Design a protein around this ligand. Sequence first.
Ligand SMILES: Nc1ncnc2c1ncn2[C@@H]1O[C@H](COP(=O)(O)OP(=O)(O)O)[C@@H](O)[C@H]1O
Lengths: 339, 20
Amino acid sequence: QESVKEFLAKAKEDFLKKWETPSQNTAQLDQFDRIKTLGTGSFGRVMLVKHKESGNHYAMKILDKQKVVKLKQIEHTLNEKRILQAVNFPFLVKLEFSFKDNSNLYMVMEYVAGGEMFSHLRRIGRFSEPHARFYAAQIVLTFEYLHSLDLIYRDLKPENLLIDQQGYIQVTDFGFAKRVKGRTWTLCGTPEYLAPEIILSKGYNKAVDWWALGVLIYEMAAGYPPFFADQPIQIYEKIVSGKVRFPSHFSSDLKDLLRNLLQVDLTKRFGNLKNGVNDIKNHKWFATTDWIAIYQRKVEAPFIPKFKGPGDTSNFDDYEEEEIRVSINEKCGKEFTEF
Amino acid sequence: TTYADFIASGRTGRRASIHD
Ligand SMILES: Nc1ncnc2c1ncn2[C@@H]1O[C@H](COP(=O)(O)OP(=O)(O)O)[C@@H](O)[C@H]1O
């Protein structure tokens, strides 16, 4: 069953072509009517918009060029767009258009109306193992794909995982995604999901994404993360210790998988070994998982959000709106030339 | 319980990423 090797090989050729000669200026602001904010993160906002000529809705990520510079995220933003436009996988949100003006950078993605896994997770409390397993399999295949292209995601979390109309995951936010061979050192990500090697400024690799998968699986199944506190600094102390505790309801299989993902020793962490991703795929916790079926989206979703219209946002919280300004003077022109 | 302690903490809402 190594058509996956051939699959990845062709997938790589496809990626490299686009990574080599990226798409640019495929749209403009006036082609959309801005409706409402869907969510916000460290910087910029994501708005639900309607494309005039087609009538389709999209999620427009808006980035203030001046804020990007202030926060020293230039390179990261260029990575985000360059990578987004080049990738293609069933569980990666699609970048439909991208462009820029005097003040901002815009990345228009396909609108995923189901909302964040985060909201559903907090609301319901926690997911059953089969439910969590369903989502986990999708991330596993996603990281196998990304990693095969020398990409590190670095921002795994329920907040960046959207549920589509069929109940499948759509990964968003490549703000910290990077294409790297070897190690890297940036201190980035979300505190609760940081692998110990990131916190210890030792330098790290793809293995950090596998640690984050452990954190994700734990949080979905438990309802709360494996390492939490009121301040990030206290969180790092707990992560570094490595001492983890599992809820009484955790199956023996789940705990064994988690002990292998939330593994401080890189020579022992699953996903980072000789057999690589297959150590995870072949794990007992994933025994009932039909990997091909998952990739083909032929498995029945355990949860299908309520669909009330093409531009319905009932699955997202409401946010304080603010005018999208555009200066008559070009800002940071040289810095974002390739965007 | 761990649930209670989580629920009463200040990090149950959407978490922001860092760049430190
Ligand atoms: N394609 C999308 N469809 C629907 N909502 C989205 C989409 N992309 C992002 N969102 C919403 O926007 C939020 C932030 O997106 P993100 O890329 O993380 O931007 P920011 O830089 O503000 O963090 C998400 O957590 C989500 O609620």
